[PDB]
């Protein structure tokens with residue numbers, strides 16, 4: 001048993017409640033596994049949309065959150081009310097908002113094989129055009145992602161909309 | 171959204187409680203998805219060990235169950251007490267026992283690519299040698315599996331231990 005014995009999940013969540021809040025906000029259950037199993041807390045808001053080449057499974061265990069999405073070309077909102085499960089198809093752009101303190105969502109995805117890339121995108125609040133997109137070989141979420149986001153926030157050139165010139169707030 | 175909107179999971183489980191019991195016993199949440207998401211009920215006991223080439227994630231939502239396993243070469247038992255989560259590494263032989271009526275376990279695995287095969291095994295209760303093993307390209311669980319099991323139960327030749335001659339009960 002490379003990942004240990006079964007264990008009580010609510011107890012696990014309580015014991016890590018101090019990570020399920022800012023600044024870290026999320027914690028991965030098992031390490032070096034093909035299934036990436038994460039518990040995400042709150043509060044947290046973000047402006048980035050994730051373009052994940054594989055599926056994402058959500059189970060909102062405690063509290064509520066929601067997913068800003070793009071569907072057919074429209075800004076839509078998928079609610080994760082407490083007790084909801086959701087399976088997100090590949091490449092559906094999504095920006096999870098987790099406003100509630102003390103909330104917990106089980107998120108399961110899997111390791112991306114070599115050459116299968118994740119995208120992170122920002123759209124313009126004014127005209128809705130794509131503002132900036134970074135493709136990344138996601139090997140470690142908590143590690144390849146903060147500095148990527150920091151560079152977008154720190155460059156007005158990246159935040160500048162190619163269509164209307166509005167500078168995204170970051 | 172190829173798999174629909176979020177939805178309340180406890181409600182879903184209640185509404186399918188009549189499938190989470192014999193003869194069917196389990197129900198898959200979404201169809202034609204890369205993540206195979208299943209809710210397994212009870213009661214059910216079985217003698218087969220599954221050799222799955224990919225990981226299996228368990229979350230025992232209601233009631234209790236357990237997993238007979240082989241580890242290093244020993245018969246071991248992994249308990250799924252209500253509220254336990256568990257991640258099973260690939261190829262660890264496992265035979266889930268689900269004795270409790272009205273129980274529910276979330277089981278998540280993924281579609282096997284072409285040429286990656288599942289194995290199903292039976293061991294001898296007397297000397298512990300391997301008695302019979304079928305490799306299968308698992309494309310649909312509820313479909314390729316009953317007739318496979320029916321053939322093992324129906325053939326004393328398959329149940330006959332190569333080491334000691336005891337005929338497995340099936």
Ligand SMILES: Nc1c(O)cccc1C(=O)O
Nearest residue numbers: 038040050096105107109
């Ligand atoms: N967007 C997410 C991700 O890509 C991995 C784990 C969690 C989330 C999230 O819902 O916050």
Ligand SMILES: Nc1c(O)cccc1C(=O)O
Nearest residue numbers: 208210220266275277279
């Ligand atoms: N062994 C299982 C499997 O291979 C798929 C879904 C459920 C189970 C189970 O735990 O009963």
Ligand SMILES: [Fe+2]
Nearest residue numbers: 050052056094
């Ligand atoms: Fe994502």
Ligand SMILES: [Fe+2]
Nearest residue numbers: 124127161164
């Ligand atoms: Fe714009």
Ligand SMILES: [Fe+2]
Nearest residue numbers: 220222226264
């Ligand atoms: Fe299995």
Ligand SMILES: [Fe+2]
Nearest residue numbers: 294297331334
């Ligand atoms: Fe035997």
